[PDB]
Amino acid sequence: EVQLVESGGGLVQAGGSLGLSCSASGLLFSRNSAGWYRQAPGKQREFVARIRMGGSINYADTVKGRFTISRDNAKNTVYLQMNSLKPEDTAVYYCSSWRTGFYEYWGQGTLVTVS
Amino acid sequence: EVQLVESGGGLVQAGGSLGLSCSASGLLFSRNSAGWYRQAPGKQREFVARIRMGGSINYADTVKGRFTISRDNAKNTVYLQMNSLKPEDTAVYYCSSWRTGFYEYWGQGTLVTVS
Amino acid sequence: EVQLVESGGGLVQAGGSLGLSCSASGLLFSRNSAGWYRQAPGKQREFVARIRMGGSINYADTVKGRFTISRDNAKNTVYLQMNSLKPEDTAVYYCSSWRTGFYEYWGQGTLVTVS
Amino acid sequence: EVQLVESGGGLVQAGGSLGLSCSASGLLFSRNSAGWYRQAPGKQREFVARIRMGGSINYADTVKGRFTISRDNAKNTVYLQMNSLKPEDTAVYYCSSWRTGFYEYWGQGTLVTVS
Amino acid sequence: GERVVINISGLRFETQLKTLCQFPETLLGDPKRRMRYFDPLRNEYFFDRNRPSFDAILYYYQSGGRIRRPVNVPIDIFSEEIRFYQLGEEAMEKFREDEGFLREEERPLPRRDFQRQVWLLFEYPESSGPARGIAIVSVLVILISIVIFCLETLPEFRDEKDYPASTSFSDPFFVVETLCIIWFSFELLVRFFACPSKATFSRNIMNLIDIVAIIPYFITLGTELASLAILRVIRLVRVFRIFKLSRHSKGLQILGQTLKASMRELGLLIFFLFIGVILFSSAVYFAEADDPTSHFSSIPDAFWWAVVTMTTVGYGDMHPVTIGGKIVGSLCAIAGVLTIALPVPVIVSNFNYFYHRE
Amino acid sequence: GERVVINISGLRFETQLKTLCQFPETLLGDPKRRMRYFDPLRNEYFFDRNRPSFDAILYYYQSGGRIRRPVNVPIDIFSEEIRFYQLGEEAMEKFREDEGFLREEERPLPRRDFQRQVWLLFEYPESSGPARGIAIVSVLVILISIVIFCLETLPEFRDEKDYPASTSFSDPFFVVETLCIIWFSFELLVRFFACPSKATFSRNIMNLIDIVAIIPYFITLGTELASLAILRVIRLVRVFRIFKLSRHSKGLQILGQTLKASMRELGLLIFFLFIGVILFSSAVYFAEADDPTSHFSSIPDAFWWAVVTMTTVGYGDMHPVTIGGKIVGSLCAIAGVLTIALPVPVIVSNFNYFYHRE
Amino acid sequence: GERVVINISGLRFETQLKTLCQFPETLLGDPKRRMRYFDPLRNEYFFDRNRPSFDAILYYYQSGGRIRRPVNVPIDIFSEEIRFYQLGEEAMEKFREDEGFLREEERPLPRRDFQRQVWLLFEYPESSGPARGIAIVSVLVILISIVIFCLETLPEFRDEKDYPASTSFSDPFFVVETLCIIWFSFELLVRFFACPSKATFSRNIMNLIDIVAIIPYFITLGTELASLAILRVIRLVRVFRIFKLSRHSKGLQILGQTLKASMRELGLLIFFLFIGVILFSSAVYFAEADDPTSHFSSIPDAFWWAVVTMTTVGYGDMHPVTIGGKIVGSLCAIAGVLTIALPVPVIVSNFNYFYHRE
Amino acid sequence: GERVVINISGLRFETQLKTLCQFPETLLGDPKRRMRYFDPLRNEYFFDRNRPSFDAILYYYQSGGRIRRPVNVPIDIFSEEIRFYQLGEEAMEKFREDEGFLREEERPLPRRDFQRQVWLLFEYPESSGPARGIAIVSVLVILISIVIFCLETLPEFRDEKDYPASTSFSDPFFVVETLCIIWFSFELLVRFFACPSKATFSRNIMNLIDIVAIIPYFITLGTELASLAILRVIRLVRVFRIFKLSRHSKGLQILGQTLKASMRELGLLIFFLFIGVILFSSAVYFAEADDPTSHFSSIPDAFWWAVVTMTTVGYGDMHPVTIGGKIVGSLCAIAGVLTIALPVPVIVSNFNYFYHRE
Ligand SMILES: [K+]
Ligand SMILES: [K+]
Ligand SMILES: [K+]
Ligand SMILES: [K+]
């Protein structure tokens, strides 16, 4: 099938920077909407960012400005530059690619624990 | 739309070298004329270099020899190798891609301050 | 003709990691089955891993979990990540690409001696 | 027109290694024969290596084994790995791409002075 | 026994009186009606009409009954000759059937004085001015329904819904869709309650199309007012709103008649393409499987190349890389042009017949 | 009453004298003109002409008036028969109309002795030698104007202007363009001031073309001597200088007549392509949307693939990746060849008619 | 000497009695048989039949023997006229041969009362109900054999064998293949042991096909029960199981007859393509070899581009990059459409003949 | 004055004796030759031949001279009728010219008893067995010369020469080429020194081809025995050795005749393609120039796309990226199929005429 593997671990403290990456096999990110979702322990899924097919980037109401999302369309990877890190945003950031009304695909998730 | 983002900052003093880069989204540099323009504070736009679609590279009458301009046509990037740096050429170097009689596109600009 | 050159030497001791690479000229790995074979001195060929055309990865009954095999389909290379290295797996790991019933192609081999 | 620029300078002494590169604009190396030619000061052109379109690599009668020539066909570059360097092979190694009976193209040349 | 010599402007036709009186309802079959042209001075029935047509007119009597227009007489002249000789209306019907003209009146208009007024107004756009207006309104509703069906799929229009399913009247497309479905159902129920016979209404293909163009909306509505496979089948079936444009287009009706007539030729075209696809995909798989750079992984995978080479589309995603594969691909494109060129002329002849017959 | 027996070389035609004298301006309608061939020894008008043609010649009198050439008589023989029997010039006109020949003289040449000299010199290339020279000059100017229009767009010729807009007689292209426009305006004003009637000049399509081929230059000149959308519309409209090459080419005139005649068939071709494009783009969008590697983002986006597969261009930028999408793409190429092959034979028949009629 | 005046409804045919009695086995050749219609009052044989047909009927006697149907008489009317005049059965055969109908009964059914029962049951699907069942069983076995042949090549079905060769009844495909081969051999041996003559059986192409569809299985079995080139040749030859589907399909039989008839035109098509391919590949190699980015390495390499441009497939892997190469590629596509369009109409005419003749 | 009544089996033809004796060299023009069939008992010339043909036979006398075969009489029957009535050999020639048969004997064989023996042996392959052998030898030499011309360009065969030019009998290709040129020159000089008239030899296109197939070798030899542009022009001109294969192929001769006949239609095809290419390249350049990703840099650059879309090759290197460009590209493929489909039927009709006339 299709797997959206992610590599976004590490234990960066408050401040600094960290860039998560999402890679797809059997799925073309240039042909699908993509967006990172977080889920802190003891909480539910929280929307973080979304890049529609066509570059309609829109972030959430909390992580605007301090985060950014990007796509390659040639390497088939979706990134997320986490800047102005805070201990508030400690969660297992997932990665999701979907097509409205047909299918949705998630990643096993990566852990970003801000100290 | 289209944005010609540039990454050419830094504070290199007189001498040395510095290479500015211009990247385009929604615009193919291999299909357009490209050329860097500078604008020193308190002055107006000054032509620096131009690479026509077809590699008709022609620089200005001041920065000839000490500068060079290039294109990839595969990475979709336009460069500028700034050699023999002098304090005279301190300006916010822009990046411009255009088609004669149809459209012109500029960059927000990058700052090259030579000490 | 076709040669499946490999670069997997070194003398890594027990533990650590090592990644062998197999590159093909005149043969497309995305269009063929690929699989690494080992042969310890004084022994016969021992199957290690196989990635069918279509990503049906299946390892042997000894090196499962500790090894992994991958393909690029764009760089035309077949890899092998050797993790949890043990002195037991000391052999001249070959590389093989084949089509069932038409042809089989091997590599001169690379030496992985675990101390 | 077409230029076969080369980057093979340096002053490596006897022994060691050095890899010259030849890059083409307006000429596809995958569609032409390519071959490095040397010319020591006070002497005439001396054939070094040739890679025909189709990989019929044949070196000269002196630099066999110690040299090797390669092509990318995707980066459009022709290389030359100079191993077992000797003071005998001090020359301005050129780069040449040609089509039998139609055209020949040379490079300005690069200097390999072995101490 | 009795001999009657007809004289069509100097051309004698001596025939037996029995054959002449075989049909006694015609101009020559009534002795008291053919006495007008009789000439007692020469004992012949002198006419002053076209000479070649009377050969067929007399063969009508000499063959019991049969009207075959001579190839050297024009249609109008022969029809006027039949009218003059008063052979009958069955004679005219046989003549038109032999030529190719088809006679079908039918159209059993209701006689309830109101179940026919609305029936005329809807079924026949040319019966009135409001009828033409109703036809134009139907065409406009069909076109906007097609536009809605195509636009619903644009990614731009789906912005707040462009999130994973795991995180209806407000939708602007659903409003237009439900208005179109309301008008479709209205023009269907009016036509059903104003048709003369319910047997013909439930049998016309142009009414089955209108039923199928309404079914998916109500299936979706019923399911919403509470499986995935039937949902996508239904969302594809919704495309059959373009075929209810065929009531208002005589080109689509001609196309449907052509396709019904050329059913054997369409089947032959598909069968020949299938034979050639299997043949050339087998040939190009076995001619190219020993090259480590070939992209035919199987005969089923080389079918797509063989169909795009035979139809001369040639996308270029799958192509041969070997000398033998290129020889095989060279005969696929030539043998595809023949396979296609063979039954298509028969289909085109059927189209021309149904088109110029109009 | 009176019976006249004509004898066309042994073949009797006994007809009533009234029908023979129905038209008294012909050879048989004048008793003092048909007395030359009368034979008092046998009381018959013996002729010595072709036998099959006189059947139609007599049907002309027996049907009031109607000239239908028998299918077994050649055109020249029947025309000579009409000439011998002196049926009239209206008879010849009816014969030519029935066959298919069209009679249109018109050409109201001016009679002012100078408003016709230049008119001949310009309108009719074959009236003189200078007229042929003027035609050649016009063709040369048209061709260089087309060359200028195409060359103005080459990036190489625009070197000092190849800078951003934010940083006319000197331009070499503007000089040639203004010379071409001067000659176009000259040959238009001469033809307008030398035409017989201004009503025909302002109505001919070949003069509307010459007007449209001059309008953009003057619009641009007026705007320069002081919006962006109209500017690009005008720069595209400038391409209609190739259609004033149709005055000097009888192939383009035949093509225009063919396209005017086959208007319904061109409309049917476009309508069938539209139906098929919508059908197959819907089918291939829904048959392929569940594959995460598909490049059909919507039914409107799969229209381009459906038009290039139906027309069998098959560029290969957009293609199916799924088994169901490839089945759908296989029927698009076959159903496109039929859709196209259906009305194109009608258009080709029209072209052959207008071409061989020349 | 003796003169006989026939009268076909007022139309005299005065012919010499010798020509009339040249064939004494016909209605007019027997004086004691033609006396029925004789009229002693006028010394003529009065008939009351169609007038135009008797011209050909009399030319039959006046030309020794020859039956040429007049173009203005229908087939059925002329056939009935031949039947009435009792010209003979050789006359009917000559008439059918002249028209185009071919008379071939043959079918020498065995007369052993059991070597014909099974022969009917197998050869003729319409002779019984079990015969139709046997035909359906044969078609089903052929289709599953084709399915097996195509599916054996899928990479998914070969999982435990997908290892290098240097590291049979259990295989599910071999079981179905051997059942299909058993049925093929059974229906071949039954037909061979039930045919009337062994000479016709070993000569029919539809039996050579059944032999070739069985040969590769037994070659493979014999080789297994113990070279590489013959093995791949045989594995490709196995594709000829689709041609034994032609016994059960009248479209494939028509296609085979068309291809046998249009052998010269198929050869001309291949020859014209070869001429054009060499011409345009030479032109595009020499027009493009001076550009360092061209991908025509030789005239033999530009053949593939010339065949895909002439056939208008245009994959797009090999294309021109030079102005001269693009001019040459522009005439390859136009000169390919003509080269192909020339003999294909002849082949299509042959197909239509063999198809409507059915 | 004198009246002669001919009787073609009951069908009277009463014509004036003057018209009958207008041609006194025929069967009816000689009173002492037509007296055989005269019947003094009824004062008529009773014949016993076909009735419909004598209408044309009599129109021959009544029109001075003209032979027009009636459409209802077969060719062989009418020819036999002409032979019986002994109208002459000029009558047969006029008949064959009217039908379409062309009579051209020519072939002025030399009468020197040795300048014709070798001439027969070479020019006419069917005159002997050695003549057929000479034809086979010529075809073999032509084919190997084509093979050599194509193989000389393969990069593999050029290994020691595959070095830059700045660092002939030994070459294996030059030996075969010079043997082929020797045989070509031999068969040319023999034919020139054995032809009847040197005027016809220096005028036949099939001899100009043989001259052009030898010229490049001698130009190259002379230049070698001591410019670059003429060298490449000559190396391309060497491809005209495939056209001297047309002497030995009646398909190529028919193709040449077809192309000479359809010169106006080939010109119209090129002109229509040029018009459409300019139109659609202008439309797609201006419809797509505002998109920064478009690859049409100019109208001259969009010509290549327009020719590959109009011819439906569609390589896919250049395609539209804009909505307006895709609308324009959709009409290019449809308007290209019409432009091409218009004159190609005329060319195909010419080919069928010259092909079945053979
Ligand atoms: K095509
Ligand atoms: K294509
Ligand atoms: K393509
Ligand atoms: K194509």
Short mmCIF file of N, CA, C and O in Angstrom, two decimals, chain G residues 3 12-16 19 55 58-59 62 68 264-265 268 271-272 278-279 282 286 290 297-300 305 309 312-315 326 334 338 341-342, chain H residues 7 9 42 46 48-52 74 76-77 146 149-150 153-154 232 235-236 239 242-243 249 251-252 255 266 273 304 311-315 348 355:
data_model
loop_
_atom_site.label_atom_id
_atom_site.label_comp_id
_atom_site.label_asym_id
_atom_site.label_seq_id
_atom_site.Cartn_x
_atom_site.Cartn_y
_atom_site.Cartn_z
N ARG G 3 -39.33 -17.82 -90.23
CA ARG G 3 -39.31 -16.64 -89.38
C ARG G 3 -40.36 -16.79 -88.29
O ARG G 3 -41.54 -17.02 -88.58
N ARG G 12 -42.70 -6.70 -80.64
CA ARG G 12 -42.33 -7.76 -81.57
C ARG G 12 -40.85 -8.10 -81.46
O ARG G 12 -40.01 -7.22 -81.34
N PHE G 13 -40.55 -9.39 -81.53
CA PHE G 13 -39.17 -9.90 -81.61
C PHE G 13 -39.13 -10.89 -82.76
O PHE G 13 -39.31 -12.10 -82.55
N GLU G 14 -38.87 -10.40 -83.97
CA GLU G 14 -38.80 -11.26 -85.15
C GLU G 14 -37.38 -11.81 -85.25
O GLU G 14 -36.44 -11.08 -85.56
N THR G 15 -37.23 -13.11 -84.99
CA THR G 15 -35.93 -13.76 -85.03
C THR G 15 -36.00 -14.98 -85.94
O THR G 15 -37.08 -15.53 -86.20
N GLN G 16 -34.84 -15.40 -86.43
CA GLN G 16 -34.77 -16.58 -87.28
C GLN G 16 -35.02 -17.84 -86.46
O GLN G 16 -34.55 -17.97 -85.33
N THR G 19 -31.96 -19.79 -84.84
CA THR G 19 -31.46 -19.32 -83.55
C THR G 19 -32.40 -19.71 -82.42
O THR G 19 -31.96 -20.01 -81.31
N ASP G 55 -35.46 -9.14 -74.10
CA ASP G 55 -34.30 -8.78 -74.91
C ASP G 55 -33.10 -9.65 -74.55
O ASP G 55 -32.45 -10.22 -75.43
N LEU G 58 -33.79 -13.34 -75.57
CA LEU G 58 -33.54 -13.59 -76.98
C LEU G 58 -32.06 -13.49 -77.34
O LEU G 58 -31.60 -14.21 -78.23
N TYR G 59 -31.31 -12.62 -76.67
CA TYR G 59 -29.87 -12.59 -76.91
C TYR G 59 -29.22 -13.89 -76.46
O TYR G 59 -28.16 -14.26 -76.97
N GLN G 62 -29.51 -15.78 -79.54
CA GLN G 62 -28.78 -15.16 -80.64
C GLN G 62 -27.27 -15.13 -80.43
O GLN G 62 -26.54 -14.80 -81.36
N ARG G 68 -26.96 -12.23 -69.68
CA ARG G 68 -26.53 -10.95 -69.13
C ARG G 68 -27.78 -10.19 -68.72
O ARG G 68 -28.55 -9.76 -69.58
N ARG G 264 -1.53 -8.37 -52.47
CA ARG G 264 -0.74 -7.41 -53.22
C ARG G 264 -0.82 -6.03 -52.59
O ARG G 264 0.17 -5.30 -52.56
N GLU G 265 -1.99 -5.65 -52.08
CA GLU G 265 -2.13 -4.33 -51.46
C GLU G 265 -1.43 -4.27 -50.11
O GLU G 265 -0.87 -3.23 -49.75
N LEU G 268 2.15 -3.79 -51.09
CA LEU G 268 2.37 -2.41 -51.50
C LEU G 268 2.42 -1.46 -50.32
O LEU G 268 3.22 -0.52 -50.30
N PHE G 271 5.78 -1.93 -48.74
CA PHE G 271 6.83 -1.40 -49.60
C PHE G 271 6.86 0.12 -49.59
O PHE G 271 7.94 0.73 -49.54
N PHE G 272 5.70 0.76 -49.64
CA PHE G 272 5.65 2.22 -49.59
C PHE G 272 6.13 2.74 -48.24
O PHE G 272 6.84 3.75 -48.18
N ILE G 278 12.97 4.88 -45.21
CA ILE G 278 14.37 5.08 -45.58
C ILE G 278 14.60 6.52 -46.01
O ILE G 278 15.57 7.16 -45.60
N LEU G 279 13.69 7.07 -46.82
CA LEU G 279 13.85 8.42 -47.33
C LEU G 279 13.89 9.44 -46.20
O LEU G 279 14.82 10.25 -46.11
N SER G 282 16.88 9.02 -43.67
CA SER G 282 18.10 9.61 -44.22
C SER G 282 18.06 11.13 -44.15
O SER G 282 19.03 11.77 -43.74
N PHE G 286 20.66 13.35 -41.77
CA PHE G 286 21.60 14.31 -42.31
C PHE G 286 21.21 15.75 -42.02
O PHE G 286 22.08 16.62 -42.03
N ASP G 290 24.49 17.61 -37.26
CA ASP G 290 25.42 18.65 -36.86
C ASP G 290 25.01 19.35 -35.58
O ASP G 290 25.72 20.25 -35.12
N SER G 297 21.39 8.74 -33.82
CA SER G 297 22.78 8.33 -33.96
C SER G 297 23.10 7.73 -35.31
O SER G 297 24.29 7.60 -35.65
N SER G 298 22.10 7.36 -36.10
CA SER G 298 22.31 6.76 -37.41
C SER G 298 20.98 6.73 -38.15
O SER G 298 19.93 7.02 -37.58
N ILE G 299 21.07 6.43 -39.45
CA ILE G 299 19.85 6.34 -40.30
C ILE G 299 19.10 5.13 -39.76
O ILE G 299 17.94 5.32 -39.46
N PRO G 300 19.67 3.93 -39.52
CA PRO G 300 18.89 2.85 -38.90
C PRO G 300 18.17 3.24 -37.59
O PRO G 300 17.15 2.58 -37.28
N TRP G 305 11.64 6.52 -35.56
CA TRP G 305 10.94 7.81 -35.52
C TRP G 305 10.11 7.96 -36.76
O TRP G 305 9.00 8.47 -36.65
N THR G 309 6.14 8.51 -36.87
CA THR G 309 5.66 9.78 -37.44
C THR G 309 4.85 9.45 -38.66
O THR G 309 3.82 10.08 -38.83
N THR G 312 1.60 8.20 -37.64
CA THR G 312 1.02 9.21 -36.75
C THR G 312 0.80 8.68 -35.34
O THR G 312 -0.09 9.14 -34.63
N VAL G 313 1.61 7.72 -34.91
CA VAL G 313 1.61 7.37 -33.50
C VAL G 313 2.34 8.45 -32.72
O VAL G 313 1.75 9.14 -31.88
N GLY G 314 3.56 8.76 -33.08
CA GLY G 314 4.29 9.86 -32.44
C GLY G 314 4.36 9.62 -30.99
O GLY G 314 3.61 10.26 -30.27
N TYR G 315 5.22 8.71 -30.55
CA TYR G 315 5.40 8.43 -29.11
C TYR G 315 6.05 9.66 -28.50
O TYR G 315 5.48 10.20 -27.55
N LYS G 326 12.91 19.53 -38.26
CA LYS G 326 11.48 19.73 -38.04
C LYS G 326 10.73 19.93 -39.35
O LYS G 326 9.58 19.49 -39.48
N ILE G 334 2.84 13.98 -43.12
CA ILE G 334 1.92 14.21 -44.28
C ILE G 334 2.10 13.12 -45.33
O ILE G 334 1.09 12.68 -45.88
N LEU G 338 -0.60 9.91 -46.68
CA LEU G 338 -0.88 9.56 -48.08
C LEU G 338 -0.43 8.11 -48.30
O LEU G 338 -1.28 7.29 -48.55
N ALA G 341 -2.96 6.02 -46.78
CA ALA G 341 -4.31 6.16 -47.29
C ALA G 341 -4.50 5.60 -48.68
O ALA G 341 -5.64 5.59 -49.16
N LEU G 342 -3.44 5.18 -49.37
CA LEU G 342 -3.60 4.76 -50.76
C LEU G 342 -4.12 3.33 -50.92
O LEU G 342 -5.13 3.15 -51.60
N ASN H 7 -33.90 -3.64 -89.82
CA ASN H 7 -34.75 -4.39 -88.90
C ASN H 7 -33.84 -5.25 -88.03
O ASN H 7 -33.45 -6.35 -88.43
N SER H 9 -33.91 -7.49 -85.58
CA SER H 9 -34.74 -8.46 -84.87
C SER H 9 -36.06 -7.83 -84.40
O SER H 9 -36.35 -7.75 -83.21
N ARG H 42 -39.78 -8.17 -97.87
CA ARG H 42 -40.31 -7.09 -97.05
C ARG H 42 -39.57 -5.77 -97.24
O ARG H 42 -39.90 -4.80 -96.55
N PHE H 46 -32.97 -7.28 -92.79
CA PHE H 46 -33.19 -8.03 -91.55
C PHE H 46 -31.86 -8.49 -90.99
O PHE H 46 -31.14 -9.26 -91.64
N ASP H 48 -30.10 -10.17 -87.23
CA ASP H 48 -30.48 -11.04 -86.12
C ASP H 48 -29.50 -10.86 -84.97
O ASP H 48 -28.99 -11.82 -84.40
N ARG H 49 -29.23 -9.61 -84.62
CA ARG H 49 -28.23 -9.28 -83.61
C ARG H 49 -28.89 -8.58 -82.43
O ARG H 49 -30.11 -8.52 -82.32
N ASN H 50 -28.05 -8.07 -81.53
CA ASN H 50 -28.54 -7.41 -80.33
C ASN H 50 -29.31 -6.15 -80.69
O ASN H 50 -28.90 -5.39 -81.58
N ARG H 51 -30.44 -5.92 -80.01
CA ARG H 51 -31.29 -4.79 -80.36
C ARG H 51 -30.78 -3.47 -79.79
O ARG H 51 -30.71 -2.49 -80.55
N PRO H 52 -30.44 -3.35 -78.50
CA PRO H 52 -30.05 -2.02 -77.98
C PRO H 52 -28.79 -1.43 -78.61
O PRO H 52 -28.65 -0.21 -78.63
N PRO H 74 -23.21 -4.21 -72.41
CA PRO H 74 -21.86 -4.50 -71.93
C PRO H 74 -20.79 -4.21 -72.98
O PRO H 74 -21.04 -4.17 -74.19
N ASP H 76 -18.15 -5.94 -74.00
CA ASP H 76 -17.83 -6.98 -74.97
C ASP H 76 -18.90 -7.09 -76.04
O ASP H 76 -18.58 -7.25 -77.23
N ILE H 77 -20.17 -6.99 -75.65
CA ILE H 77 -21.25 -7.08 -76.63
C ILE H 77 -21.17 -5.92 -77.61
O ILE H 77 -21.33 -6.10 -78.82
N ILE H 146 21.47 0.06 -50.94
CA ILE H 146 20.70 0.72 -49.89
C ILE H 146 21.18 0.28 -48.51
O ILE H 146 21.31 1.10 -47.59
N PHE H 149 24.40 2.04 -47.75
CA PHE H 149 24.16 3.45 -47.46
C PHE H 149 23.65 3.64 -46.04
O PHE H 149 24.04 4.58 -45.35
N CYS H 150 22.77 2.74 -45.58
CA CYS H 150 22.26 2.87 -44.21
C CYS H 150 23.29 2.43 -43.18
O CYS H 150 23.39 3.04 -42.11
N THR H 153 26.45 4.60 -41.58
CA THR H 153 26.21 5.60 -40.55
C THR H 153 26.19 5.03 -39.14
O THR H 153 26.09 5.81 -38.19
N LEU H 154 26.28 3.73 -38.99
CA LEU H 154 26.22 3.14 -37.66
C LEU H 154 27.48 3.50 -36.89
O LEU H 154 28.59 3.37 -37.42
N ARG H 232 27.80 17.59 -47.75
CA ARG H 232 26.66 17.04 -47.03
C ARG H 232 25.43 16.98 -47.91
O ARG H 232 24.62 16.05 -47.80
N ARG H 235 26.01 13.82 -49.82
CA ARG H 235 25.82 12.65 -48.98
C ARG H 235 24.34 12.39 -48.72
O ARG H 235 23.94 11.24 -48.54
N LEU H 236 23.52 13.44 -48.70
CA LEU H 236 22.08 13.22 -48.62
C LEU H 236 21.50 12.79 -49.97
O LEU H 236 20.62 11.92 -50.02
N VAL H 239 20.78 9.18 -51.34
CA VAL H 239 19.61 8.37 -50.99
C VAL H 239 18.74 8.02 -52.18
O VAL H 239 17.85 7.18 -52.06
N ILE H 242 17.18 4.43 -53.98
CA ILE H 242 15.95 3.69 -53.74
C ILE H 242 14.93 3.94 -54.84
O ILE H 242 13.98 3.16 -54.98
N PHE H 243 15.07 5.02 -55.60
CA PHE H 243 14.13 5.33 -56.66
C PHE H 243 14.45 4.63 -57.96
O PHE H 243 13.59 4.59 -58.85
N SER H 249 9.53 -2.21 -60.10
CA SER H 249 8.34 -2.28 -59.25
C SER H 249 7.22 -1.50 -59.91
O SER H 249 7.36 -0.29 -60.13
N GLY H 251 4.38 -0.98 -58.48
CA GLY H 251 3.73 -0.16 -57.47
C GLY H 251 4.32 1.23 -57.37
O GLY H 251 3.60 2.21 -57.19
N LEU H 252 5.65 1.33 -57.48
CA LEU H 252 6.29 2.64 -57.45
C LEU H 252 5.98 3.45 -58.70
O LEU H 252 5.86 4.68 -58.63
N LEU H 255 2.63 4.82 -58.13
CA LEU H 255 2.73 5.91 -57.16
C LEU H 255 3.25 7.18 -57.81
O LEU H 255 2.76 8.28 -57.52
N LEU H 266 -1.86 17.96 -54.05
CA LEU H 266 -0.75 18.03 -53.11
C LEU H 266 -0.43 19.47 -52.73
O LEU H 266 -0.18 19.78 -51.56
N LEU H 273 -2.45 23.24 -44.92
CA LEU H 273 -1.66 23.03 -43.71
C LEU H 273 -0.91 24.28 -43.30
O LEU H 273 -0.82 24.59 -42.12
N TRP H 304 5.76 24.08 -34.99
CA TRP H 304 6.09 22.65 -34.86
C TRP H 304 4.98 21.95 -34.09
O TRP H 304 4.61 20.86 -34.48
N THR H 311 -1.45 17.10 -37.76
CA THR H 311 -1.28 15.77 -38.34
C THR H 311 -1.63 14.66 -37.36
O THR H 311 -1.59 13.49 -37.74
N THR H 312 -1.99 15.01 -36.12
CA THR H 312 -2.31 14.09 -35.03
C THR H 312 -1.15 13.17 -34.70
O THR H 312 -1.34 12.06 -34.22
N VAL H 313 0.08 13.62 -34.92
CA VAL H 313 1.22 12.90 -34.38
C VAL H 313 1.31 13.16 -32.88
O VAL H 313 1.16 12.25 -32.06
N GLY H 314 1.36 14.40 -32.46
CA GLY H 314 1.34 14.74 -31.04
C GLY H 314 2.46 14.06 -30.37
O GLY H 314 2.20 13.06 -29.70
N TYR H 315 3.68 14.55 -30.54
CA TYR H 315 4.86 13.96 -29.86
C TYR H 315 4.71 14.25 -28.38
O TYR H 315 4.74 13.30 -27.60
N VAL H 348 -6.43 9.70 -53.50
CA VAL H 348 -6.71 8.27 -53.43
C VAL H 348 -7.52 7.82 -54.64
O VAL H 348 -7.34 6.70 -55.13
N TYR H 355 -4.21 2.39 -60.56
CA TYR H 355 -3.90 1.08 -60.03
C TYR H 355 -4.77 -0.01 -60.66
O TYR H 355 -4.25 -1.04 -61.08
#
